[model samples]
Target: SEDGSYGTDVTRCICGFTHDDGYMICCDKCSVWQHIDCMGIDRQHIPDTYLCERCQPRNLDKERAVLLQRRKRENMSDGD
Candidate 1:
């Protein structure tokens, strides 16, 4: 006999920490993740468009690439 339920798909953050949904934040531009505690940012202060420190320089070229990569991941996840 088998159990009635399955398990999570398993996800990780850019920092290599296991995804703990309530404590993690996903970058709106790059689809990468960082924990709120690790980044020293409070959730209440987050903006509509969130970006990680590595992408926060806001240079046009880097921002554009991050947006593209984020969209690609969104597309891939559409079928999930």
Candidate 2:
């Protein structure tokens, strides 16, 4: 038995604090969450869910690889 179906508590996220309206922006793919109000979204008409900026697994993997490559180059560089 459960007390009730409790909706997600966005307040747990750092960006959740910025959200004042009933609509709390949560990532659709990642942990990154933002408030609709913070982004200037109208609270009167809140959307069901907030899509993440970019959380695609493939995209994230590619981006991470690029970062690693860049870091490797920097590490080997002699300030040139």
Candidate 3:
């Protein structure tokens, strides 16, 4: 479901927008989908396993953990 199939129903991207008619990439670590343009990623050269800024290895010690906590709380509220 990280493919942005839910479209406007789900809030995504670091820009905090819903999916539209554009390219999107999902973070391999967090499964969070983001607009390719927002991430400044090349449309023709996407990595097989993309990691978002907050999920990158160097940021894992801080931001990644925080994101995980937030995601967990959201998931719980969403009845996951």
Candidate 4:
């Protein structure tokens, strides 16, 4: 088999694919790129600030609370 050299580098998104024809959005929090369709975001109603699910502070709070609860459970297990 012959090895071929590629001319241009592909741009991958959060969805783990590349799309040149479609619109893409960059996360304001993490600066990651994602396709609008992959994110299910409306093209006509784009927000001023875009944050991916992992970078959203609102979700972070909920995740933090979950971690705290898990730590408490671990502490109780250790005490017993």
Candidate 5:
């Protein structure tokens, strides 16, 4: 709410919520953000409905995969 942009990630199935790409981003049914390439959509186009592979109404769970990657980046940031 402070970044002036909506949340680009979602909750984790077993841990946390985050975003990894530009497609995983759900616009309705799901409340997450991801990239198109990560979602297997190599068309270079962002979905208007923002549907996942299954093309569900929204696809919030789809964000889980995206968040997984996000966690990795965060862990690496503190590399020692």
Candidate 6:
């Protein structure tokens, strides 16, 4: 709590737990913190871009939207 990683004022999880070493993982997509135990995975096994359960679906939706928009733009400009 002294190194400023976990402090008196810090972002918490939906479970209301604050970030701590060996206890949390920061979601790459939503930027929220999640407990490592709650994720059912170990720190050594975490993926390159960690996405929490709450953010996976939302992230997929956003990716799909971007792909759709890019496809639409490509198709529209292909003819012109």
Candidate with the greatest TM-score versus the true structure: 3
Using TM-score as the measure, what is the rank order of every candidate, best first?
Answer: 3, 4, 6, 1, 5, 2
Candidate 2 stretches with Cα past 4 Å from truth are 1-23, 52-80
Each prediction's TM-score versus the true structure: 0.43, 0.33, 0.53, 0.48, 0.36, 0.45
User: Which 10-residue span in candidate 1 carries the lowest summed lDDT?
Assistant: 7-16
* lDDT digits (tens) for residues 49-69 of candidate 2: 555334432222334433544
Query: What's model 6's TM-score?
Result: 0.45
Cα deviation at 53, candidate 5, in Å, is 4.2
For model 1, residues 1-80, the per-residue Cα lDDT tens digits are 48576533233343444543466666776676665544545767765665666677633343443454455456665553
- TM-score of candidate 1 against the unseen true structure: 0.43
> lDDT of each structure?
0.54, 0.47, 0.59, 0.55, 0.50, 0.54
lDDT of 3: 0.59
What is candidate 4's lDDT per residue for 2-34, written digit by digit as tens? Answer: 898653423435444455435777676566665
Q: Kindly give the number of clashing pairs for every candidate.
A: 0, 0, 0, 0, 11, 0
4 or 5, greater by lDDT: 4
> Regarding lDDT, does 1 or 3 come out ahead?
3
Higher-TM-score candidate of 4 and 5: 4
lDDT digits (tens) for residues 1-80 of candidate 3: 67666433233456544565357777776777776555656778878787776776443233443464456446666533
RMSD of 4: 12.9
TM-score, predicted candidate 4 vs. hidden true structure? 0.48
Report the lDDT of model 5 for residue 80. Answer: 71
